[PDB]
Amino acid sequence: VDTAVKTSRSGYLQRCIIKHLEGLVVQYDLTVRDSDGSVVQFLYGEDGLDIPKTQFLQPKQFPFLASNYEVIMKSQHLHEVLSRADPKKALHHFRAIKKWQSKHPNTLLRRGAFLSYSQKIQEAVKALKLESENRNGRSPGTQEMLRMWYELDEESRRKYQKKAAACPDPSLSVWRPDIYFASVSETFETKVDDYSQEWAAQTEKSYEKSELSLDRLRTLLQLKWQRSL
Amino acid sequence: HGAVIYATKGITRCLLNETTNNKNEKELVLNTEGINLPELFKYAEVLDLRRLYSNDIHAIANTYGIEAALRVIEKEIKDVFAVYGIAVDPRHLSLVADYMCFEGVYKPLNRFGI
Amino acid sequence: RITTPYMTKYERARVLGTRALQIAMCAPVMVELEGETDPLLIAMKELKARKIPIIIRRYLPDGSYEDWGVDELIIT
Amino acid sequence: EEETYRLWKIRKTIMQLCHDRGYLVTQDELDQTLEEFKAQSPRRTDLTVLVAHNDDPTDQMFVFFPEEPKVGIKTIKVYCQRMQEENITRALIVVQQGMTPSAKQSLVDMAPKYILEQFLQQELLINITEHELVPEHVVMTKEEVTELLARYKLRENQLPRIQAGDPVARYFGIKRGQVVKIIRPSETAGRYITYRLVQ
Amino acid sequence: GILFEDIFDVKDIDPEGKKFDRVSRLHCESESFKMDLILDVNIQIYPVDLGDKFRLVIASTLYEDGTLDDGEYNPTDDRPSRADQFEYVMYGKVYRIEGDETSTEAATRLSAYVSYGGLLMRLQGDANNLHGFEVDSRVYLLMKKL
DNA sequence: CTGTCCTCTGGC
DNA sequence: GCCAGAGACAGCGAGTCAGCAA
RNA sequence: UGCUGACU
Numbered sequence: 001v002d003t004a005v006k007t008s009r010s011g012y013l014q015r016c017i018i019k020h021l022e023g024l025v026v027q028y029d030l031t032v033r034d035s036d037g038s039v040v041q042f043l044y045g046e047d048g049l050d051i052p053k054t055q056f057l058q059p060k061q062f063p064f065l066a067s068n069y070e071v072i073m074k075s076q077h078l079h080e081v082l083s084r085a086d087p088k089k090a091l092h093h094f095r096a097i098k099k100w101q102s103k104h105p106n107t108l109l110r111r112g113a114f115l116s117y118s119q120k121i122q123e124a125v126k127a128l129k130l131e132s133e134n135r136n137g138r139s140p141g142t143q144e145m146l147r148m149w150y151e152l153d154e155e156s157r158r159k160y161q162k163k164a165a166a167c168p169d170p171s172l173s174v175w176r177p178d179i180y181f182a183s184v185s186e187t188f189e190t191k192v193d194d195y196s197q198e199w200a201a202q203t204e205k206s207y208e209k210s211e212l213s214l215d216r217l218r219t220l221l222q223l224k225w226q227r228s229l
Numbered sequence: 230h231g232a233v234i235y236a237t238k239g240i241t242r243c244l245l246n247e248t249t250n251n252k253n254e255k256e257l258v259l260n261t262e263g264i265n266l267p268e269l270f271k272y273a274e275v276l277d278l279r280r281l282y283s284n285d286i287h288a289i290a291n292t293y294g295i296e297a298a299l300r301v302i303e304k305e306i307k308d309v310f311a312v313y314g315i316a317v318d319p320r321h322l323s324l325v326a327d328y329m330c331f332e333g334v335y336k337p338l339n340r341f342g343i
Numbered sequence: 344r345i346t347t348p349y350m351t352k353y354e355r356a357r358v359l360g361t362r363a364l365q366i367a368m369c370a371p372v373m374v375e376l377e378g379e380t381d382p383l384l385i386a387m388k389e390l391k392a393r394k395i396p397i398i399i400r401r402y403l404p405d406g407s408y409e410d411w412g413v414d415e416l417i418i419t
Numbered sequence: 420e421e422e423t424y425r426l427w428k429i430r431k432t433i434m435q436l437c438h439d440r441g442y443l444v445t446q447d448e449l450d451q452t453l454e455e456f457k458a459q460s461p462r463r464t465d466l467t468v469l470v471a472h473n474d475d476p477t478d479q480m481f482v483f484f485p486e487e488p489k490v491g492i493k494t495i496k497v498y499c500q501r502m503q504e505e506n507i508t509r510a511l512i513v514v515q516q517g518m519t520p521s522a523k524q525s526l527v528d529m530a531p532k533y534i535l536e537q538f539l540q541q542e543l544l545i546n547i548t549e550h551e552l553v554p555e556h557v558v559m560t561k562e563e564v565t566e567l568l569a570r571y572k573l574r575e576n577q578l579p580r581i582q583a584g585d586p587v588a589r590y591f592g593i594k595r596g597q598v599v600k601i602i603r604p605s606e607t608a609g610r611y612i613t614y615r616l617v618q
Numbered sequence: 619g620i621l622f623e624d625i626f627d628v629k630d631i632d633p634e635g636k637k638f639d640r641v642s643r644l645h646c647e648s649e650s651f652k653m654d655l656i657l658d659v660n661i662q663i664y665p666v667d668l669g670d671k672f673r674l675v676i677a678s679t680l681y682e683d684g685t686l687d688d689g690e691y692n693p694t695d696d697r698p699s700r701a702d703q704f705e706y707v708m709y710g711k712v713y714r715i716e717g718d719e720t721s722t723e724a725a726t727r728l729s730a731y732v733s734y735g736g737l738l739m740r741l742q743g744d745a746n747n748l749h750g751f752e753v754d755s756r757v758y759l760l761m762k763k764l
Numbered sequence: 765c766t767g768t769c770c771t772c773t774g775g776c
Numbered sequence: 777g778c779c780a781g782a783g784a785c786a787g788c789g790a791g792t793c794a795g796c797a798a
Numbered sequence: 799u800g801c802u803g804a805c806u
């Protein structure tokens with residue numbers, strides 16, 4: 001009885017779903033648009049990468065791609081694609097992202113130019129602002145900081161701005177994952193870094209000869225990503 | 230019978246399910262069987278109001294916005310499929326939630342949505 | 344000039360279909376067929392040799408298009 | 420002395436809201452604890468703050484904390500006068516029970532001359548922007564929206580919509596017709612970026 | 619062409635408890651070397667018991683005269699001086715060499731895992747005398763009781 | 765056999 | 777003008793084979 | 799078209 005009734009309800013649910021999400025196709029600019037052009041997503045899975053091809057891009061499947069590297073390059077990508085790849089635009093972007101995240105370990109700490117010009121906090125609290133009340137609701141000691149910062153600082157060399165600027169925007173956002181080599185997702189490159197560090201420290205104690213280098217495995221993984229798109 | 234001394238609007242009962250984690254077993258959760266988001270904002274020192282979750286998706290969409298209701302929709306579909314061992318890929322629920330919440334509101338996927 | 348350089352699988356399918364429907368309508372085969380009676384096998388033989396004078400006209404969602412050559416397209 | 424805890428939470432939340440809009444706020448205000456808030460400041464007319472903008476030093480904002488639990492048209496006029504005389508354009512009215520319904524369309528009626536905005540007191544007890552599920556919103560500049568529309572060959576309609584009464588469009592004070600960038604922390608791709616036209 | 623030669627003695631007939639049908643896993647231990655051997659042996663063809671000795675050799679060629687092996691099996695080969703002083707001959711490949719765990723210690727011992735179709739062997743002992751091995755290398759395991 | 769409409773109706 | 781009373785009202789899996797009566 | 803059986 002339950003089988004019959006369950007199928008009766010599931011058929012209708014699926015018909016409704018299919019009748020609303022049917023016109024959503026990936027476009028030549030990698031954006032998921034509806035029939036009238038309305039942008040639903042700016043990247044299919046939030047990174048592209050249709051499902052069936054992302055099965056071996058998980059970690060724990062790299063020791064397989066590394067073991068079968070010669071077959072994978074000969075059978076699919078080949079030496080032709082590996083050397084017809086130019087990764088500079090995307091590689092520099094990830095270097096910038098890494099430097100930023102190196103200077104800002106806590107990424108929820110309210111970065112700001114003026115906020116960065118609160119290190120004199122002790123300089124002000126010591127003796128300067130000891131005499132006032134809440135003039136316009138702010139403080140007696142906040143007004144001294146406002147005065148020192150506002151126009152008593154350099155014209156164009158008051159660059160507390162650079163110490164407090166946004167993280168570069170993700171690479172897939174700026175560098176067109178399809179036609180741009182090495183432009184991958186921020187969660188894939190982390191996995192690749194972790195695996196390269198845990199794989200260069202296995203070759204050292206391997207009693208087998210490995211003719212693959214960390215920087216050929218990296219290009220292999222980057223091509224296998226760019227092609228699962 | 231329908232005369233109640235006093236109650237928080239929308240909440241019918243609370244309960245502290247002592248343990249919810251093994252990794253950091255020390256976690257405690259104050260589950261509820263009603264829904265009133267603002268009537269918990271007064272306890273930001275007793276309870277963690279970041280990490281607040283509800284299955285309503287219309288109440289989340291009214292206290293936190295639509296980009297926060299997208300993820301509640303996705304997590305709800307995932308937890309519905311999880312009770313049977315089924316596991317749909319996140320790339321599908323992402324598209325379904327992005328389409329449902331396209332035009333600023335949680336719109337039903339039915340005859341009035343067309 | 345900005346779309347992907349490779350030939351999507353849908354493009355390969357449609358190009359093979361069209362080349363086959365042309366061959367079948369008595370079109371000259373530039374591939375030196377070797378005794379095969381299938382026009383689709385001949386179309387694949389031509390695609391592998393990079394002899395197909397067709398222009399894939401990729402349409403963008405706003406009407407703008409880009410004209411690619413079947414020769415200037417990386418077939419996987 | 421719970422009124423003071425509520426006042427302190429609301430003041431901290433409003434300082435964070437003013438810093439997220441790009442107003443000159445010091446670290447001490449953003450890191451002010453209760454013991455020192457109550458040390459400084461009791462009332463509901465000396466909690467009023469006046470903040471300046473990073474650029475456009477004339478462009479400043481004024482936060483009100485009306486006494487009337489239900490603000491009315493007269494209460495709105497009494498300090499629209501204050502704003503008009505002190506020569507400011509923006510305001511922010513934190514109300515304790517609500518605004519009588521005619522007032523909401525009056526605040527709207529005041530043309531860009533003096534643009535005001537209301538916030539309930541229970542809406543400011545916590546910073547929704549600090550929830551796990553709420554992404555980071557960034558009001559795009561008029562020259563970035565053009566480049567976006569040019570890169571995707573879009574129109575401003577045909578973009579996802581964010582309601583003008585959205586709890587995170589009211590917080591970031593985004594007017595209608597503005598596009599906001601949204602950085603979703605995605606478990607799949609890390610830092611997905613989306614765009615929504617405020618309407 | 620020998621890579622290893624020694625005289626073992628069976629200590630355990632099958633400790634793990636996994637029991638297969640015609641195969642028995644012997645846990646031996648060398649003499650005068652104190653090397654260890656785990657050896658799956660087909661006991662329907664070659665019965666082995668406890669407290670039993672046997673001379674064991676690992677080679678890379680059966681000719682014992684230098685000429686390499688061709689990787690092809692002929693039961694018709696006319697060179698018949700291949701090692702036949704041995705009753706049980708196998709033929710497998712080494713698939714894993716792993717230096718021992720101990721760090722901060724000499725611990726220059728190696729465990730060589732050989733597969734003989736499906737019958738695994740593990741030779742553990744001083745690396746000094748397990749150098750001839752290398753992963754993916756074909757080897758013959760000749761044995762002869764005593 | 766359920767959930768929204770959704771168009772009254774009706775009272776206030 | 778504020779929001780209950782409803783009271784209509786619309787939806788309810790896919791395909792296939794027969795016979796019999798009107 | 800209808801209705802009564804039946805199949806996955």
Ligand SMILES: Nc1ccn([C@@H]2O[C@H](COP(=O)(O)CP(=O)(O)OP(=O)(O)O)[C@@H](O)[C@H]2O)c(=O)n1
Nearest residue numbers: 002003004005006007008011789790791805806
């Ligand atoms: N009304 C129906 C009845 C059946 N079907 C279809 O027939 C399949 C097999 O039915 P089934 O009843 O044989 C189930 P199965 O798991 O194969 O049975 P078992 O346990 O004995 O092996 C179902 O799974 C549906 O796809 C349908 O579409 N509508």
